[PDB]
């Protein structure tokens, strides 16, 4: 672009589209579950991945991954959304916080307890 | 409730009548003086115009016209009299105006 051109039109800043429409751009959002499913994953892998459809306080309805070895999440339970994609399940853009209102933490989880929301046990 | 800054709104209305009266006099007298200039009567126009002037500065004594707002009225008035008197001039009284 000639300098003349750059004066006539100029550059154009690049608008970054958010990857997480947890509206009000909030750090989390609380929602109520619709279903608790198990989804067949993308190509190189296979398992039964536990997910949840959630109605949000933002008026949104989105899938969310349930981390941890086992969940207590039921059809009508309320939960808190985290964000962060499951790479190998298309369309799942938000994790679920374990150790929040109706989603207990993982029992007997002793290594990474900040994630998966479990307290510190006692030793005799 | 019941703040006695209410007393202030009371006086507000009293002063409303004081200012409104003097202004009503100014306007009623000013137009009277000009109707005579426009009708040629030189003495009566002047003798009246002087009382308009007095009533104007008197209104400027208090909070009615306090500024040069009063001189604005005096200025615009004395012009129209002398000019409207210019149809058959003969400025008889010549009280308020200058030689």
């Amino acid at each position: 672009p000639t300098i003349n051109q750059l004066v006539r039109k100029g550059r154009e800043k690049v608008r970054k589209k958010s990857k997480v429409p947890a509206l009000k751009g909030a750090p989390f959002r609380r929602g109520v579950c619709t279903v608790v499913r198990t989804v067949t994953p993308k190509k190189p892998n296979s398992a039964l991945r536990k997910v949840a459809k959630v109605r949000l306080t933002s008026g949104y309805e989105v899938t969310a991954y349930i981390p941890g070895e086992g969940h207590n999440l039921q059809e009508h339970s309320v939960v808190l959304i985290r964000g962060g994609r499951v790479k190998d399940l298309p369309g799942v853009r938000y994790h679920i916080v374990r150790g929040v209102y109706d989603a207990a933490g993982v029992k007997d989880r002793k290594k990474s307890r900040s994630k998966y929301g479990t307290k510190k046990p006692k030793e005799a | 409730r019941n703040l006695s800054a209410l007393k202030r709104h009371r006086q507000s209305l009293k002063r409303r009548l004081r200012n409104k009266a003097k202004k009503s006099a100014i306007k009623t007298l000013s137009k009277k003086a000009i109707q005579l200039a426009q009708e040629g009567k030189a003495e009566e126009a002047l003798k009246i115009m002087r009382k308009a002037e007095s009533l104007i500065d008197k209104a400027a004594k208090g909070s009615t016209l306090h500024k040069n707002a009063a001189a604005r009225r005096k200025s615009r008035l004395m012009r129209k009299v002398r000019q409207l008197l210019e149809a058959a001039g003969a400025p008889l009284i010549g009280g308020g105006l200058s030689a």
Partner: protein
């Protein structure tokens, strides 16, 4: 220092008023090249002295009307209609680029 500008009379068609076009030259704040911008000023001409094509000094003045805050100081150069014809052509180009 009342702002004093030097431009050209582009419009004659008002009463006691002429439109002055004033060019301006400055380096661009990022790209640096010197760029040429223009603004039309409505200047007060009480004697209707100044005519179309006269290059005139303009002076920041006490307001005359809406959109009139400058008066015509003096005449710099008389009757160069080339400046006007560049402006007229430009105005005339806008008649395309609609439909």
């Amino acid at each position: 220092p009342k702002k004093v500008l030097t431009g050209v009379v582009v419009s004659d068609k008002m009463q006691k008023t002429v439109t002055v076009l004033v060019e301006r030259q400055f380096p661009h704040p990022l790209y640096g090249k010197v760029i040429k911008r223009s603004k039309k000023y409505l200047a007060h001409d009480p004697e209707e002295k100044y005519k179309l094509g006269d290059v005139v000094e303009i002076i920041e003045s006490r307001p005359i009307s809406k959109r009139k805050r400058f008066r015509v100081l003096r005449l710099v150069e008389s009757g160069r209609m080339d400046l006007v014809e560049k402006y007229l052509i430009r105005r005339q180009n806008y008649q395309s680029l609609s439909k």
